[PDB]
Design a protein around this ligand. Sequence first.
Ligand SMILES: Nc1nc2c(ncn2[C@H]2C[C@H](O)[C@@H](COP(=O)(O)OP(=O)(O)OP(=O)(O)O)O2)c(=O)[nH]1
Ligand SMILES: [Ca+2]
Ligand SMILES: [Ca+2]
Ligand SMILES: [Ca+2]
Ligand code: NA
Length: 341
Amino acid sequence: GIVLFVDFDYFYAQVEEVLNPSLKGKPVVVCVFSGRFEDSGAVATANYEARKFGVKAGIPIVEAKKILPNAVYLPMRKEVYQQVSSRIMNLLREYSEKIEIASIDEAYLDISDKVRDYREAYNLGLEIKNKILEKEKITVTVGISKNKVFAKIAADMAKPNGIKVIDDEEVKRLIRELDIADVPGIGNITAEKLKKLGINKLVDTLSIEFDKLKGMIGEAKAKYLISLARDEYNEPIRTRVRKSIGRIVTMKRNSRNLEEIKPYLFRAIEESYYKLDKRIPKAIHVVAVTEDLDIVSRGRTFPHGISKETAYSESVKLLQKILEEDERKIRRIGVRFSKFI
DNA sequence: GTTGGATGGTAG
DNA sequence: CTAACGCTACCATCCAACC
Ligand SMILES: Nc1nc2c(ncn2[C@H]2C[C@H](O)[C@@H](COP(=O)(O)OP(=O)(O)OP(=O)(O)O)O2)c(=O)[nH]1
Ligand SMILES: [Ca+2]
Ligand SMILES: [Ca+2]
Ligand SMILES: [Ca+2]
Ligand code: NA
């Protein structure tokens, strides 16, 4: 059993360097503008040049301007990044039809039948990386291991433009010296809870009672960390199914006025009903970001699918609810559909 | 006891 | 307006309704 993992290098920023190569070698920052004021919004991603100076996903655009006033700031063009992603994902299918597309810029391939060993896997990694570069001009990191989770860790250790092959015998070694925070699924919260417990390496999970682990981080994730330490966690490659589709937009000013919020709500419904593309949901939720950036939601499950007309009607009702049940202003407003027929 | 539903969290 | 966009999977916690 051998899985190969691909993750595209500084993707949105790289696509922009492909479309305009006079950008190559200078810092590029791709931005989600929010129209609240001049350069309101956050950074989606930046190339490695920009990153060395602290510019990374999630910081405000104006924070990045204060560090790199002369970097190149381009608006995010999702549609274009998605066409490139699809072309590449189609490319990957020809190397294995057993492919799990995991996000806009990554995918897992089961290559068990395409190669006789890990050294041939490496060679296949080199070919995949070369062809992607030849056809779409985009560099990528490849991580090969015995299973998804280790294939992913392998890729993280190698980025950017790299390839790393942890084979079934080197995996044991990895478990011992992996930082617990470098485990996929362990963020700052979980990673910090675990320090309050002596667990710094992955392997340390095996030397602590199950209950104390389940107590701090819950059942699902405790079982996850333990089974991974024992090297008994071979989760299968499966085609991705969309379970929910939605859209959220940022208002030009905070408000609790229904008429002032509706235009944005309706824009989110229209856009997310288009993204639905013939799917028919039985669940709708209105999500609100509050002035203090907390997130509240209200929703309904119908026994039948929801028409665009029903969505318009019920979403106003759910927004009304939010406004009655919570006293703060709204800063962002959106909808999400789930439970497809 | 299940299990779906409403709502909120963590992560990538 | 004063810094913090958007997307979606999976999990947890409570609940009443169920077979
Ligand atoms: N708008 C937005 N897009 C994001 C955010 N995080 C990631 N993305 C998008 C933009 C990235 O180019 C793309 C892939 O994300 P990655 O996590 O793999 O990082 P990226 O490819 O940019 O750099 P890479 O070399 O891994 O480090 O996903 C975020 O917070 N906001
Ligand atoms: Ca990436
Ligand atoms: Ca990625
Ligand atoms: Ca982590
Ligand atoms: Na061997």
